[PDB]
Design a protein around this ligand. Sequence first.
Ligand SMILES: N[C@@H](Cc1c[nH]c2c(Br)cc(Br)cc12)C(=O)O
Ligand SMILES: N[C@@H](Cc1c[nH]c2c(Br)cc(Br)cc12)C(=O)O
Ligand SMILES: N[C@@H](Cc1c[nH]c2c(Br)cc(Br)cc12)C(=O)O
Ligand SMILES: [Fe+2]
Ligand SMILES: [Fe+2]
Ligand code: NI
Ligand code: NI
Ligand code: NI
Ligand code: NI
Ligand code: NI
Lengths: 240, 232
Amino acid sequence: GAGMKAILQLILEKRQEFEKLPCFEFVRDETISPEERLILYPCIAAFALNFRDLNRYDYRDDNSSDYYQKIINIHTQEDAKHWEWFLNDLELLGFDKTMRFSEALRFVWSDDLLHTRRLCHNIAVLSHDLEPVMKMVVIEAMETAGLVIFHALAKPGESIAKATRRKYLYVADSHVEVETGHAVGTENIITILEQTQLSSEQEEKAKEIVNKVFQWSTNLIGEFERYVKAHRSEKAQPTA
Amino acid sequence: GMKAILQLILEKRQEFEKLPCFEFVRDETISPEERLILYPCIAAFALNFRDLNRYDYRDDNSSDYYQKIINIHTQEDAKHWEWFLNDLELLGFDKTMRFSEALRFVWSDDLLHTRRLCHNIAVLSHDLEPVMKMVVIEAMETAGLVIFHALAKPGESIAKATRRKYLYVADSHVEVETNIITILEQTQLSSEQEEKAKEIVNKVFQWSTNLIGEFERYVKAHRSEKAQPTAA
Ligand SMILES: N[C@@H](Cc1c[nH]c2c(Br)cc(Br)cc12)C(=O)O
Ligand SMILES: N[C@@H](Cc1c[nH]c2c(Br)cc(Br)cc12)C(=O)O
Ligand SMILES: N[C@@H](Cc1c[nH]c2c(Br)cc(Br)cc12)C(=O)O
Ligand SMILES: [Fe+2]
Ligand SMILES: [Fe+2]
Ligand code: NI
Ligand code: NI
Ligand code: NI
Ligand code: NI
Ligand code: NI
């Protein structure tokens, strides 16, 4: 009934708040070079391969006969390939820097990237005892936040891609388009959710999920904002 | 009760000590530089273990008696990652590489069990009462003692041969690892807690065995990548 409807409206409310965070104002500001606006890019290293593992090992259950878990398995197979795109654009942007192994470790495990590093961990802990329909709410919330980020990042990414004549794959419109999903075959999760009735217990759990996902995503964006503030003298060094 | 749990930890420890990786690490006919080929694998574990102690085991919001003891314990164990980074440099494993090669190493499919051990412990632990979290910590510390007892053999050989202070694959680390076993022995367990404690001990030792299997496979895949320490 109007249980699911409330949950999907809560996601749109939270997306509308999330869209207005100062980090996105900065990322969208075409008066600052695109190379300066992507100086947060290396921070995603603490998230992107954790997100691959969340998809491979936490969301996925290859043995499930459950209708909803099978839809999750198809979607998370594709979403788990995007880490290679991250590493592709890391190199194009000049951020694939030579350093000591320990410097890479100290960067990823920085206290200034705690919320970035633990977002997938938090989702796995939230997700551990959820039935597949409730896992679909986690994924839909996480993917809604992710689409806001990549719709913003693709703005300077596409400006650099065009200017350098280089194919960007992660901070790129192609990432946003394949992530959204508009292909013949298996339905989008949002289509399934639109057609599913929530019990009162499921509705309270779904509100908790949506509030947590958006809080943890906001915590991650806060760390990107403080990293940028500490590096405005620095820029991406793409070559043509 | 607790009697049966501490006996099972001893049993599991006895079986763990026998894995082929430990036979290799203890083999003094192999150079200690070759036996520590597995050292860099620990990169996928050691900083995750710092975070497990800081963020998962620790709860600075709680006033319960057991959680207060855990908290103190987690304050010591959260320091050992710096010792890992110290010995990385001394062994010649703090290699200059591309940022992407560091990431591809840690997130290697060949270090999946190593990388996910602390994640697995956090998920196991997140809804346990403090006394049951103590069981997780004691099991995990018992498996860690078997490993560092073994690694400290080739470690201390290199430390003496080079006159450098090793801190992670070293007797000092083993000695600090050896209050919580004490109050576990003087604690009453319901039948519910007893059954959960058995499950915790079996998972911790299964996950640790999976990590040790990856270290063994790594050594065999990288037989030319021996440590390159230097004398002071
Ligand atoms: N589409 C992203 C996944 C994603 C989904 N949600 C995300 C959030 Br919240 C923050 C960051 Br950074 C990334 C994401 C990817 O391919 O890594
Ligand atoms: N692109 C479509 C679904 C779709 C995606 N690719 C398509 C191709 Br190629 C052929 C045909 Br007919 C349909 C499609 C969409 O977004 O509406
Ligand atoms: N004493 C270890 C902690 C430890 C505790 N248990 C461990 C296991 Br199982 C595997 C490995 Br590698 C390490 C540990 C440390 O300080 O990093
Ligand atoms: Fe993606
Ligand atoms: Fe330790
Ligand atoms: Ni999809
Ligand atoms: Ni389409
Ligand atoms: Ni739980
Ligand atoms: Ni300890
Ligand atoms: Ni290798």
